[PDB]
mmCIF file of C-alpha atoms in Angstrom:
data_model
loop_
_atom_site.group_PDB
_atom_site.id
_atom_site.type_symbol
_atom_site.label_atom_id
_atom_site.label_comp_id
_atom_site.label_asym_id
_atom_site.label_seq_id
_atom_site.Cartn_x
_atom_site.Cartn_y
_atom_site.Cartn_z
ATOM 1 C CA UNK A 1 8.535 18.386 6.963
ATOM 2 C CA UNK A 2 11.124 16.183 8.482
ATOM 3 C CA UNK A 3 12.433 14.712 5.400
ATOM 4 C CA UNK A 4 15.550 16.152 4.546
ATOM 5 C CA UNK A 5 16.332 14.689 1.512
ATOM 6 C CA UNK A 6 13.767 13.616 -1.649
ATOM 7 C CA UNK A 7 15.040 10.357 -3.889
ATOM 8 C CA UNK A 8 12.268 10.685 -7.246
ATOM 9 C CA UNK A 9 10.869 7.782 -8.612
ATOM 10 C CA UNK A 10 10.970 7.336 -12.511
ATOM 11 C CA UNK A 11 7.329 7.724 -12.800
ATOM 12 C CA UNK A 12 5.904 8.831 -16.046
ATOM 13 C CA UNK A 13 3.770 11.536 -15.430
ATOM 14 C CA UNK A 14 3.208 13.095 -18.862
ATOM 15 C CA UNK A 15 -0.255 11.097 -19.301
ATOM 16 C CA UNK A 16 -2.474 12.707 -16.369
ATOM 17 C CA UNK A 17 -3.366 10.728 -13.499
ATOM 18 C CA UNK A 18 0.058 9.112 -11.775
ATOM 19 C CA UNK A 19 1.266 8.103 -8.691
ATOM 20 C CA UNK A 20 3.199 10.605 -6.542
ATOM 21 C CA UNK A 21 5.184 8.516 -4.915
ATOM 22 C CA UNK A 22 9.262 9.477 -3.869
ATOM 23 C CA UNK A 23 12.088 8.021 -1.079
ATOM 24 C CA UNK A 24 12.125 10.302 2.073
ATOM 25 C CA UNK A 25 15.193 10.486 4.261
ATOM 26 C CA UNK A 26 15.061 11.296 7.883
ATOM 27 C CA UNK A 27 17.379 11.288 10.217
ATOM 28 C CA UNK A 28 15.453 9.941 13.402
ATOM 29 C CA UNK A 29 13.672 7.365 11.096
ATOM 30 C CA UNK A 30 14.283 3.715 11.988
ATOM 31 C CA UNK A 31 14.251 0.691 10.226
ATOM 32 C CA UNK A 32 12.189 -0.376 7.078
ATOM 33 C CA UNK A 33 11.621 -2.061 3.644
ATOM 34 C CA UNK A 34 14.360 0.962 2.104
ATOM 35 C CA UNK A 35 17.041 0.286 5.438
ATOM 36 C CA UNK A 36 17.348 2.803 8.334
ATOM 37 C CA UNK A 37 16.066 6.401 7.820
ATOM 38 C CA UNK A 38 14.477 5.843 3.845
ATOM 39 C CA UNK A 39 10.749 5.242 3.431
ATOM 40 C CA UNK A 40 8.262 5.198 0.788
ATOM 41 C CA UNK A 41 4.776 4.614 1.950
ATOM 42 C CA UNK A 42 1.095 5.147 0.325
ATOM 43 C CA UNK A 43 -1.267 6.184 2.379
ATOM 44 C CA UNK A 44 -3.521 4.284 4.727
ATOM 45 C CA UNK A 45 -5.915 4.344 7.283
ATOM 46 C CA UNK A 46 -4.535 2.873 10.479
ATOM 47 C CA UNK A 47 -5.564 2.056 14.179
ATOM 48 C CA UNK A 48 -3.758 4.265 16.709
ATOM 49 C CA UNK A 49 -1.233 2.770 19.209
ATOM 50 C CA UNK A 50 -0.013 5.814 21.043
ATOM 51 C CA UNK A 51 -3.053 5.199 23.677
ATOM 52 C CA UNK A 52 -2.160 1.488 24.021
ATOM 53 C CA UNK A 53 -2.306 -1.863 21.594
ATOM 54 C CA UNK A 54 -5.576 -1.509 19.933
ATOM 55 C CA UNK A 55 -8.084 -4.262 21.076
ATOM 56 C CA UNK A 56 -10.234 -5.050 17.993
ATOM 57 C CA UNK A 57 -13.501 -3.127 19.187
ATOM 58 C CA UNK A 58 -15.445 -0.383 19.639
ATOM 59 C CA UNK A 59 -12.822 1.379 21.862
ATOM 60 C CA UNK A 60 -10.179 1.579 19.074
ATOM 61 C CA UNK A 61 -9.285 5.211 17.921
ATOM 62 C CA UNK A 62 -8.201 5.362 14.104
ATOM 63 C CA UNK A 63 -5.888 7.562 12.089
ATOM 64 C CA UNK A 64 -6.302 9.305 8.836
ATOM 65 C CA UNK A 65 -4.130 9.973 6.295
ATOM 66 C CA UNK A 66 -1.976 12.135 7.827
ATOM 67 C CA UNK A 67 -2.240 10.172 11.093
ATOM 68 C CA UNK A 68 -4.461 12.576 12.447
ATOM 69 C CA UNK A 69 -6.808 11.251 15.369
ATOM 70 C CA UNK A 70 -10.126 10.572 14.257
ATOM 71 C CA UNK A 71 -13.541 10.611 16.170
ATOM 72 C CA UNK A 72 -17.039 9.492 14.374
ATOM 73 C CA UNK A 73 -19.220 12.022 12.780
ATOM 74 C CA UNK A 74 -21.712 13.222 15.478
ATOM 75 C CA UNK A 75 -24.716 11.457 14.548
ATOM 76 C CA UNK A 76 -27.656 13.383 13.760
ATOM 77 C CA UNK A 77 -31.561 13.424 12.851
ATOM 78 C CA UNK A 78 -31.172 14.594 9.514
ATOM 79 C CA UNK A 79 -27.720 13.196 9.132
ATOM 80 C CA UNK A 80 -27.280 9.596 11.064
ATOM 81 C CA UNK A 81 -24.346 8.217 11.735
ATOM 82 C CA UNK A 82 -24.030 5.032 10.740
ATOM 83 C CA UNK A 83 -25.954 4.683 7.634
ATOM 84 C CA UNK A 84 -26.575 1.203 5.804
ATOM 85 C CA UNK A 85 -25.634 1.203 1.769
ATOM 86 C CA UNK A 86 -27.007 -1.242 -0.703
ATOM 87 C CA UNK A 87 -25.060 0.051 -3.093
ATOM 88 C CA UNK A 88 -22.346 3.185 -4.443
ATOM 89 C CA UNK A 89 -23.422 4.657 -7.763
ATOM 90 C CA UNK A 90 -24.845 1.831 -9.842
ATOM 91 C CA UNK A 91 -22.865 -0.687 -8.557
ATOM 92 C CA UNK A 92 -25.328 -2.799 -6.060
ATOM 93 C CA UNK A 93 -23.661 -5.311 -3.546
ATOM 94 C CA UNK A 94 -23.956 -8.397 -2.788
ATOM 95 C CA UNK A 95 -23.988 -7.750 1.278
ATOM 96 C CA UNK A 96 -25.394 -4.113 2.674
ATOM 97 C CA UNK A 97 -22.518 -2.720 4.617
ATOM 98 C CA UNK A 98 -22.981 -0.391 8.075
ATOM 99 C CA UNK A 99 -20.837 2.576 6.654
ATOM 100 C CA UNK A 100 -19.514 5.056 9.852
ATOM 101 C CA UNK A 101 -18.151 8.414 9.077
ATOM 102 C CA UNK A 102 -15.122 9.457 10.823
ATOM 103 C CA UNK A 103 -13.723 13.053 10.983
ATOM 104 C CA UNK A 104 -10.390 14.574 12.717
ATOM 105 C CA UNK A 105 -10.921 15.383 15.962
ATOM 106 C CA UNK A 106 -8.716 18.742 16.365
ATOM 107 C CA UNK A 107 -6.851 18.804 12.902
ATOM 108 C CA UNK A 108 -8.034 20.755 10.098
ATOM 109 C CA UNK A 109 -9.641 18.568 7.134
ATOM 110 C CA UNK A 110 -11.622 19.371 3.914
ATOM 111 C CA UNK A 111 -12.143 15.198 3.007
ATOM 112 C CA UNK A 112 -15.293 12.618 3.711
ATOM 113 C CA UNK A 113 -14.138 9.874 5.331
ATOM 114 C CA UNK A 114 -15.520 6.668 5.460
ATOM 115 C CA UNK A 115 -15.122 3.091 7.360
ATOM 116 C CA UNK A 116 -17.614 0.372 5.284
ATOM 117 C CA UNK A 117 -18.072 -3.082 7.122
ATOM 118 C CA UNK A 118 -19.820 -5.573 5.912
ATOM 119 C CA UNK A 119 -23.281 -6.620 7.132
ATOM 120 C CA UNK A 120 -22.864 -10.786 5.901
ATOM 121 C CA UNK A 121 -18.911 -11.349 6.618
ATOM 122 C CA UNK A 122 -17.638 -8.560 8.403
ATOM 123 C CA UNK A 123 -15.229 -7.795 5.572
ATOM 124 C CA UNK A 124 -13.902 -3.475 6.166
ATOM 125 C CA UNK A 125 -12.400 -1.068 4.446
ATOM 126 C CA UNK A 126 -11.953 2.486 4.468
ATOM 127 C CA UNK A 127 -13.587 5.290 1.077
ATOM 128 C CA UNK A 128 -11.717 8.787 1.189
ATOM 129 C CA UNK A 129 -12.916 11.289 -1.014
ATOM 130 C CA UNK A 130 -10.047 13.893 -0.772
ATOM 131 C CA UNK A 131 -10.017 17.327 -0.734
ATOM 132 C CA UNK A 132 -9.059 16.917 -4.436
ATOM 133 C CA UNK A 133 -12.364 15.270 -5.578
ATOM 134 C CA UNK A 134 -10.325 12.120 -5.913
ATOM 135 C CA UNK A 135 -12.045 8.533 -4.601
ATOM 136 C CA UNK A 136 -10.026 6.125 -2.548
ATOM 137 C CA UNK A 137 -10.352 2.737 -1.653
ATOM 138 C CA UNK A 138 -8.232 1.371 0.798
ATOM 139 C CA UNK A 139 -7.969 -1.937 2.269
ATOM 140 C CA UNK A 140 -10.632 -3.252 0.069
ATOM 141 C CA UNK A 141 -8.931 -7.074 0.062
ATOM 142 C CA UNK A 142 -7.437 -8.368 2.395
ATOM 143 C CA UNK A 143 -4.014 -8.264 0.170
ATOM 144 C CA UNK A 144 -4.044 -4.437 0.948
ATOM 145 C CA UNK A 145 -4.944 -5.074 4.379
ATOM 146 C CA UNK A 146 -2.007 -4.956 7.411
ATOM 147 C CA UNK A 147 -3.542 -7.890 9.960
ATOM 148 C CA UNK A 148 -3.265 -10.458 12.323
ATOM 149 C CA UNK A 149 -2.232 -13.505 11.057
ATOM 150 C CA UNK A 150 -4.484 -15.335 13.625
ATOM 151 C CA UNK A 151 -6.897 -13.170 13.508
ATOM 152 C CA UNK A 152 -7.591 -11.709 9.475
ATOM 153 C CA UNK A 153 -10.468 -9.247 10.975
ATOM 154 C CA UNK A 154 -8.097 -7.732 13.665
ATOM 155 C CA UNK A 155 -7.043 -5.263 10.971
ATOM 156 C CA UNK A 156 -3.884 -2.458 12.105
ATOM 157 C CA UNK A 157 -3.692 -0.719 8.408
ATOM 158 C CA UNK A 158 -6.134 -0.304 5.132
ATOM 159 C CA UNK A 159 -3.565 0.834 2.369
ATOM 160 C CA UNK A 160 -4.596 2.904 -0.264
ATOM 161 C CA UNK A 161 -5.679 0.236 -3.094
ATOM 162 C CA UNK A 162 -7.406 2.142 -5.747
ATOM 163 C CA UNK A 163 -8.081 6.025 -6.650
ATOM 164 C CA UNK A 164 -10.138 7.106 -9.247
ATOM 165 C CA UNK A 165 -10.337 10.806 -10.801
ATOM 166 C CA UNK A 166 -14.134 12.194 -11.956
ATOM 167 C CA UNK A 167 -12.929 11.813 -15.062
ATOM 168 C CA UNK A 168 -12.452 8.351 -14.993
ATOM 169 C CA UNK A 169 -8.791 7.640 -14.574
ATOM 170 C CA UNK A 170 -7.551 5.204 -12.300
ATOM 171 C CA UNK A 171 -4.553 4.145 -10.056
ATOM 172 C CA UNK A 172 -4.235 0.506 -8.812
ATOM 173 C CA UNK A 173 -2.242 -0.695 -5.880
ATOM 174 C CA UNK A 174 -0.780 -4.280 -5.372
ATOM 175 C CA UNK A 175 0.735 -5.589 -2.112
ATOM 176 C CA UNK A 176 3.196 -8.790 -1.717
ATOM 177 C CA UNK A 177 2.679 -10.375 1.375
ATOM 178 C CA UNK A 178 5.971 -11.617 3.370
ATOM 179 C CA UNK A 179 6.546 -15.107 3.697
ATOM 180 C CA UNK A 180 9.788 -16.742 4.129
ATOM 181 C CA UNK A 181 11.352 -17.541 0.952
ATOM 182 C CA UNK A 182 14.851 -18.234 1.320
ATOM 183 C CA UNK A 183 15.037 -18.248 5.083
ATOM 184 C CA UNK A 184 16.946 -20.191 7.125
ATOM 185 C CA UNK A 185 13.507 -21.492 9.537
ATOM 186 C CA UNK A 186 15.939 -22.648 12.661
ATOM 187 C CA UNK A 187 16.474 -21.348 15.611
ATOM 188 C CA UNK A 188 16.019 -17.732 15.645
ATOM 189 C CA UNK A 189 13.363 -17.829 12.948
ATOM 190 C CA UNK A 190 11.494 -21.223 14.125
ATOM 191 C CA UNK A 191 7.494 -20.317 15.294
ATOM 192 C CA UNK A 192 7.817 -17.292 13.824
ATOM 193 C CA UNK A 193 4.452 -15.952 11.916
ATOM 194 C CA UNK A 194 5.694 -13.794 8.985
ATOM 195 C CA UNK A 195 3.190 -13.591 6.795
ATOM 196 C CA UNK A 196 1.431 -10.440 8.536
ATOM 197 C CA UNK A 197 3.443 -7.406 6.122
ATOM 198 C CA UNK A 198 2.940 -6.128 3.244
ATOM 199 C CA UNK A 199 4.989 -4.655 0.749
ATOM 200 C CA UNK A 200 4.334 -2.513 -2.355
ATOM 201 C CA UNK A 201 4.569 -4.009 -5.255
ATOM 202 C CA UNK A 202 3.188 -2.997 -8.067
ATOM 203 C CA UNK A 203 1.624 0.598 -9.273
ATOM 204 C CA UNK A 204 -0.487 -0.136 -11.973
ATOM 205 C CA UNK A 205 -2.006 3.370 -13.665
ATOM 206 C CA UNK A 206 -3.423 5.023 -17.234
ATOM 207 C CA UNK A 207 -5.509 2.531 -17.959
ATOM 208 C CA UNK A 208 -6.999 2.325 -21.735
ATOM 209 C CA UNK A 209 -10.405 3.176 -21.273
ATOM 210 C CA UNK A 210 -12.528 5.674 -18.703
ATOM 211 C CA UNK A 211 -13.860 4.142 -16.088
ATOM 212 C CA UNK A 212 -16.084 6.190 -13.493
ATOM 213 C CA UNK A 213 -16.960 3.820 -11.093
ATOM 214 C CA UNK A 214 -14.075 2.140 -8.725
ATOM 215 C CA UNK A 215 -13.276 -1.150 -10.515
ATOM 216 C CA UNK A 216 -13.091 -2.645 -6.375
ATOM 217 C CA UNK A 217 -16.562 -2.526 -5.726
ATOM 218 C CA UNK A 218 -17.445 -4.953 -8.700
ATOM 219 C CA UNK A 219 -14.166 -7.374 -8.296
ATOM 220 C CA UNK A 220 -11.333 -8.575 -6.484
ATOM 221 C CA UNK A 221 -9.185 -7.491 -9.161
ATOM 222 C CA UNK A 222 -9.308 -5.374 -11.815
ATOM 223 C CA UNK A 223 -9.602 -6.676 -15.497
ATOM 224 C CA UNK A 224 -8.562 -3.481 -17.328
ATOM 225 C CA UNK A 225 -5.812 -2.965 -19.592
ATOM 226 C CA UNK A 226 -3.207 -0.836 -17.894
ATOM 227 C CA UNK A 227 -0.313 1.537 -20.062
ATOM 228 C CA UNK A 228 1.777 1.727 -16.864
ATOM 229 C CA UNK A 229 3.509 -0.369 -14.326
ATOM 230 C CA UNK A 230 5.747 0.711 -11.429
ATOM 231 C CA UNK A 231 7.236 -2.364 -9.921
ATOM 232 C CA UNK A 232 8.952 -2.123 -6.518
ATOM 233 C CA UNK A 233 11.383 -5.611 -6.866
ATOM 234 C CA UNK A 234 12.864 -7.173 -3.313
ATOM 235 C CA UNK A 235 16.048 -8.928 -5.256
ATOM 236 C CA UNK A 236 13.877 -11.243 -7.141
ATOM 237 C CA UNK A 237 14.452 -9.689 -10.713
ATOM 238 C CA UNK A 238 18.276 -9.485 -10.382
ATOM 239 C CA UNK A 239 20.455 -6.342 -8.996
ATOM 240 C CA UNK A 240 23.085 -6.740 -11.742
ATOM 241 C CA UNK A 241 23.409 -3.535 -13.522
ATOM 242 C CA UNK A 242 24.783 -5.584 -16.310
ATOM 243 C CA UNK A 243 20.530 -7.760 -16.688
ATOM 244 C CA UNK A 244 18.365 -5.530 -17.145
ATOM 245 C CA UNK A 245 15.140 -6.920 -15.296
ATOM 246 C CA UNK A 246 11.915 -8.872 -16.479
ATOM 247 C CA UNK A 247 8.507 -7.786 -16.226
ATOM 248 C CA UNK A 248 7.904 -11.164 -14.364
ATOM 249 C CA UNK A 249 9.844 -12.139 -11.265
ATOM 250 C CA UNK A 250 11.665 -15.332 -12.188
ATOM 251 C CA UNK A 251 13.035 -16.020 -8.560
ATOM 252 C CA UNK A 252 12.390 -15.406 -4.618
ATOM 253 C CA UNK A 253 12.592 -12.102 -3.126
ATOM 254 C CA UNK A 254 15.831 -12.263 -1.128
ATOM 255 C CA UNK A 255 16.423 -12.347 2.295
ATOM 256 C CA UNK A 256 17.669 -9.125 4.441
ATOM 257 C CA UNK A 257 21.232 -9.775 7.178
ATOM 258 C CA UNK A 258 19.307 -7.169 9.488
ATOM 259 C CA UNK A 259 15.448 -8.894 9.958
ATOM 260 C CA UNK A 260 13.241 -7.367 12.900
ATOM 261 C CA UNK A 261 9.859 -7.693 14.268
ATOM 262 C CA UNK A 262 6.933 -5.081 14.816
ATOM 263 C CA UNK A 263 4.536 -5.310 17.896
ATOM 264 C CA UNK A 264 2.695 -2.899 18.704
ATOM 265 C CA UNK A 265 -0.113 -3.690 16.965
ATOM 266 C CA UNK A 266 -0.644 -6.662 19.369
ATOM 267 C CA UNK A 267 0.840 -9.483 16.701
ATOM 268 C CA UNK A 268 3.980 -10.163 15.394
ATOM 269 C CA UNK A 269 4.906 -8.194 12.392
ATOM 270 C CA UNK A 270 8.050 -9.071 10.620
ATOM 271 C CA UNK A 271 10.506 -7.563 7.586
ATOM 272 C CA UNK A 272 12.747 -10.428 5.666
ATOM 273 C CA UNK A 273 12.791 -7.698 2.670
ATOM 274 C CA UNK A 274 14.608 -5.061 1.270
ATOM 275 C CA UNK A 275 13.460 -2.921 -2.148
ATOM 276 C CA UNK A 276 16.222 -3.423 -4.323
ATOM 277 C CA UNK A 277 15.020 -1.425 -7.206
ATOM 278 C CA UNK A 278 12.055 0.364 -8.890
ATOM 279 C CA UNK A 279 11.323 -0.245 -12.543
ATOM 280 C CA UNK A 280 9.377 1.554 -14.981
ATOM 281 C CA UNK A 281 7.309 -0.290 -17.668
ATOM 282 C CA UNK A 282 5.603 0.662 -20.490
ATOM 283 C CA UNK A 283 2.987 -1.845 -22.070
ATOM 284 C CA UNK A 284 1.824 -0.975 -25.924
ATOM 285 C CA UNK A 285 1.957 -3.755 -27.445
ATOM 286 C CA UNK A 286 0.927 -2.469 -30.469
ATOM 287 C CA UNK A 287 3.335 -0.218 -31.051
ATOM 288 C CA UNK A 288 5.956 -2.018 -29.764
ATOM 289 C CA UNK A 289 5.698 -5.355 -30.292
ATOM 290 C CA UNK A 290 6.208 -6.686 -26.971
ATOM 291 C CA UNK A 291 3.533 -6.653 -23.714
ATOM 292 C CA UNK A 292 5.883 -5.094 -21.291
ATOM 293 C CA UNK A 293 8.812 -2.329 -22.076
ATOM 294 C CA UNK A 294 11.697 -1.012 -19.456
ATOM 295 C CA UNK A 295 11.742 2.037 -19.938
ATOM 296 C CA UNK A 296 14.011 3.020 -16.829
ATOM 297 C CA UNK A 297 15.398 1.114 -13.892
ATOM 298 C CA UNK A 298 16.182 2.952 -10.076
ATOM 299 C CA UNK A 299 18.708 0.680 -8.758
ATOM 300 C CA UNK A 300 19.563 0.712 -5.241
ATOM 301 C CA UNK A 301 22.662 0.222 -3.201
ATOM 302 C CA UNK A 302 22.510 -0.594 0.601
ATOM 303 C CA UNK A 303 25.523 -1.508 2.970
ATOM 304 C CA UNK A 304 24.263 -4.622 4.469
ATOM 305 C CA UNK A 305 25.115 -5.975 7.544
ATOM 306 C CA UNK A 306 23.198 -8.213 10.324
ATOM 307 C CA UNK A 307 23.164 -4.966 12.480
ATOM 308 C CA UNK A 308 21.795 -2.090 9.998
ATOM 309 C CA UNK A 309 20.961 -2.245 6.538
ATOM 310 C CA UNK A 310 21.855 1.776 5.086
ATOM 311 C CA UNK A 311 21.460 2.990 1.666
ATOM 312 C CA UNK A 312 24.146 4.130 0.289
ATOM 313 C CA UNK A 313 23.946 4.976 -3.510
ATOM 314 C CA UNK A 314 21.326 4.976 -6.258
ATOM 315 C CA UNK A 315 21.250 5.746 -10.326
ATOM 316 C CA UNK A 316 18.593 5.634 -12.443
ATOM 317 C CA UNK A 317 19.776 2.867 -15.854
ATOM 318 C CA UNK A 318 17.996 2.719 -19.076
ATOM 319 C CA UNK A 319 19.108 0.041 -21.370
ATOM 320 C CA UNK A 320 18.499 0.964 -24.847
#
């Protein structure tokens, strides 16, 4: 589309079910966690903003995956529109949520779409089931969840937190959220609320055993023993190509020379991070003799400067 130049990830891929994640470039892109131009996203549901600051209600529009405008499935006799679920599979809930269908309104889709909230504390979330008989849950905790600081059920973005295959296989999503680790809190920065982004973090995938239902519904976080682990790291490994990094951040994320702020969402949304690097990690223990292996490292290079931060080179290191 408008990306004019692809950056790959070192994802291993040869075991099935992986993320397909790379770094985009466009030209007329503006600012992000990867510097001007450079993204890497997963997908999410999101409120639209085009038509004015969403206002938390029943008037809000919402966009799917490909930010397409959505409209609620036409509710029917035989089909209505909401329905209230107990339960998904044989997994049976502790609160019945009202579950809405939504649909595009003009674009072309062949997905089920769905928008659960729940009936005893309001918690939402969005369940795709692609056009690829994949099943998504996004924004299932509110770690994966883009919100109001002041307001945690004024939600602008449900990332993608977990996909599951029929056959069982699983990707898991992890999200830092900002803070303000080694910022200077005067002046500029004082009564700031910074706590509202989220970054990727962690891509955690092939896990040991097959699993068919979403481990999400059952648990806030899944106790399953993953084989793969793509870390996105914000400085707080080490950028020395000389270290290689730890599985296990040792330090604070560090602080960007070009910080900004996001509003229209209708709060205060602001970026103190840059991703300095994405690892690769490995974890057979047994037949390695160590819980976590780097297996290859994408370092990053930016030109930083209080005006623009700009990527400028990248490598991929392995240190054998």
């Amino acid at each position: 589309g408008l990306a004019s130049i692809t950056l790959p990830l070192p994802i291993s891929a040869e075991r099935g079910f992986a993320p397909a994640l790379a770094l985009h470039y466009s030209s007329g892109g503006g600012n992000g966690p990867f510097g001007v131009g450079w993204s890497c996203a997963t997908m999410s549901i999101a409120r639209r903003t085009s038509h004015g600051v969403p206002q938390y209600n029943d008037s809000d529009e919402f966009l799917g995956p490909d930010g397409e405008v959505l409209v609620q499935t036409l509710s029917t006799g035989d089909a209505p529109n909401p329905v209230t679920c107990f339960a998904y599979g044989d997994v049976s809930f502790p609160q019945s949520y009202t579950v809405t269908r939504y649909q595009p309104r003009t674009e072309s889709s062949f997905y089920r779409l769905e928008y659960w909230v729940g009936n005893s504390n309001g918690d939402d979330f969005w369940l795709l089931h692609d056009s690829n008989g994949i099943l998504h849950l996004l924004g299932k905790t509110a770690a994966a969840r883009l919100s109001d600081p002041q307001a945690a059920s004024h939600t602008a973005q449900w990332l993608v937190e977990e996909s599951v295959t029929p056959a069982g296989e699983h990707i898991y999503y992890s999200y830092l959220a900002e803070n303000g680790d080694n910022v200077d809190l005067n002046g500029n920065e004082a009564g700031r609320d910074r706590s509202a982004m989220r970054y990727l973090s962690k891509v955690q995938y092939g896990n040991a055993t097959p699993a068919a239902d979403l481990y999400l519904w059952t648990s806030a976080t899944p106790a399953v023993q993953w084989l793969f682990t793509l870390v996105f790291d914000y400085g707080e490994r080490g950028v020395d190509p000389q270290v290689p990094p730890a599985f296990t951040a040792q330090n604070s994320w560090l602080a960007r020379q070009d910080p900004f702020s996001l509003y229209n969402y209708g709060f205060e949304i602001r970026l103190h991070r840059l991703c300095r690097q994405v690892l690769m990690f490995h974890h057979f223990p047994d037949e390695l003799g160590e819980a976590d292996t780097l297996v290859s490292r994408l370092l990053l290079e930016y030109d930083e400067n209080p005006i623009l931060t700009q990527l400028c080179a990248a490598r991929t290191l392995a240190y054998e």
